[PDB]
């Protein structure tokens, strides 16, 4: 029941600012420090620093002492992370995490004390791109000429994510929707492919159902040779 | 700053096997505050172990930790399907105190070698009408993850104009699939006739080449 609730995903242009919140629940917000951890896409964890919830004093990691500011609002039992002059490199999931520092002895040390993050917020995605919300162009990947492969190229859409299904979910076996890739255009492209019996290409229908909520773009494209 | 070396980046074990992950520090591991974290796709990290060997509340008993000298170790006595994930070690320490994470170790499902099925897809007419041409090469259901995909346009090796994307391990058979997408302008696409991707993979007795003639 200890929980950290983070604000929703954010889309910002280069040079803008963002302010993400993390509200504690099930514990005294001022009894535990909060760490801020960033995870860039396809990358590991980066400690941004911590905020003393008792004093409001922030500690910034070596590389985040300039455009990153940690703040508090003990009234709403919530902490904040503001990034200024955003860069595409700031594109990442930002996580709030409750620090636990306890042990035995007069003075804290690694031989007698424990430092760990027990409760983490679900994370706040921050996408920094000079690109604008665009919907996906769904092109078919027609089967060639005992198993046939066919698919749909969901290309040039922004921002993530796009959902893809086959036969509105009736076709689940053999389906592979590839992670989205960012093109030089600043737009995203992904392909969804399924393997079917070559004998069913004339008899059975195969349509890919793309859904890009960020643009309310919903598309059903049939794929045929 | 202290550097935590997690090796290998990818640890291939079968479900049911005993797994040990290593976190090797550039100094003595017990000189910092240690912890192990697990991260599953799309989720926050999850605390497993803190200190050398203290198991966090709610964590299965199969997880244990040990630390001596420069080695910090997470042991998973029997890998369950939900244990295939990325694991991060932590060292909070150093003179300018710093929270240092390892680079992460992905525990991936080891299965028998599986050669890929290769398919090639020409750009559709719909996209050709838009002025760009995407050619797609599919490697379907292979293991292990390493594969060499080479594009050739009229036998000219392509570089700098393709992107590869790999799925996560399939839930049913634990294989990978890979798409390689070659992007060309409609103009460029029309100058050449034969488009081909050649696949090299441990499971193939020799490399596989799939191609098509534009227009046939």
């Amino acid at each position: 029941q200890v929980q950290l609730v983070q604000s929703g995903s954010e889309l910002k242009k280069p040079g803008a600012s963002v302010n993400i919140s993390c509200k504690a629940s099930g514990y005294n917000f001022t009894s535990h420090a909060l760490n801020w951890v960033r995870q860039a896409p396809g990358q590991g964890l980066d400690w941004l620093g911590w905020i003393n919830t008792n004093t409001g004093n922030p500690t910034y990691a070596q590389g985040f002492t300039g455009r990153f500011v940690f703040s508090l609002d003990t009234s709403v039992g919530s902490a904040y992370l503001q990034i200024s002059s955003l860069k595409a490199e700031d594109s990442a999931v930002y996580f709030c995490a409750r620090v636990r520092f306890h042990g035995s002895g007069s003075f804290p040390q690694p031989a007698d004390f424990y430092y760990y993050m027990d409760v983490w917020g679900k994370g706040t995605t921050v996408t920094v791109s000079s690109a604008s919300t665009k919907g996906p162009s769904v092109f078919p990947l027609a089967p060639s000429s005992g198993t046939a492969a066919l698919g749909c190229l969901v290309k040039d859409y922004f921002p993530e994510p796009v959902t893809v299904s086959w036969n509105s979910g009736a076709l689940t076996s053999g389906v592979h929707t590839f992670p989205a890739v960012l093109q030089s255009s600043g737009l995203y492209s992904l392909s969804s492919v399924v393997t079917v019996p070559s004998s069913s290409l004339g008899t059975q229908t195969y349509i890919c159902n793309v859904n890009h909520k960020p643009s309310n773009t919903k598309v059903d494209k049939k794929v045929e040779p | 700053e202290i550097v935590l070396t997690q090796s290998p980046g990818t640890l291939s074990l079968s479900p049911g096997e005993r797994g040990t992950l290593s976190c090797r520090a550039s100094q003595s591991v017990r000189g910092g505050y240690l912890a192990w974290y697990q991260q599953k796709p799309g989720q926050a990290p999850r605390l497993l172990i803190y200190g050398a060997s203290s198991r966090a509340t709610g964590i299965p008993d199969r997880f244990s930790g040990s630390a001596s000298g420069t080695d910090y170790t997470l042991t998973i006595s029997r890998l369950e399907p939900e244990d295939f994930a990325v694991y991060y070690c932590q060292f909070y320490g150093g003179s300018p105190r710093a929270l240092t994470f390892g680079g992460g170790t992905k525990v991936e499902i080891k299965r028998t070698v599986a050669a890929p099925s290769v398919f090639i897809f020409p750009p559709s007419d719909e996209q050709l009408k838009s002025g760009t041409a995407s050619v797609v090469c599919l490697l379907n259901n292979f293991y292990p993850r390493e594969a060499k995909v080479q594009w050739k346009v009229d036998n000219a090796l392509q570089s700098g104009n393709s992107q590869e994307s790999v799925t996560e391990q399939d839930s049913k058979d634990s294989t990978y699939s890979l798409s390689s997408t070659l992007t060309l302008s409609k103009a460029d696409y029309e100058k050449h006739k034969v488009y081909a991707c050649e696949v090299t993979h441990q499971g193939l007795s020799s490399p596989v080449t799939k191609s098509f003639n534009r227009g046939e």
Partner: peptide, 16 residues
């Protein structure tokens, strides 16, 4: 003591 005062003590001590 607030455990965060202890965290602040560990931070300054490490500067040695």
């Amino acid at each position: 003591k607030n455990e965060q005062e202890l965290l602040e003590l560990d931070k300054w001590a490490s500067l040695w």
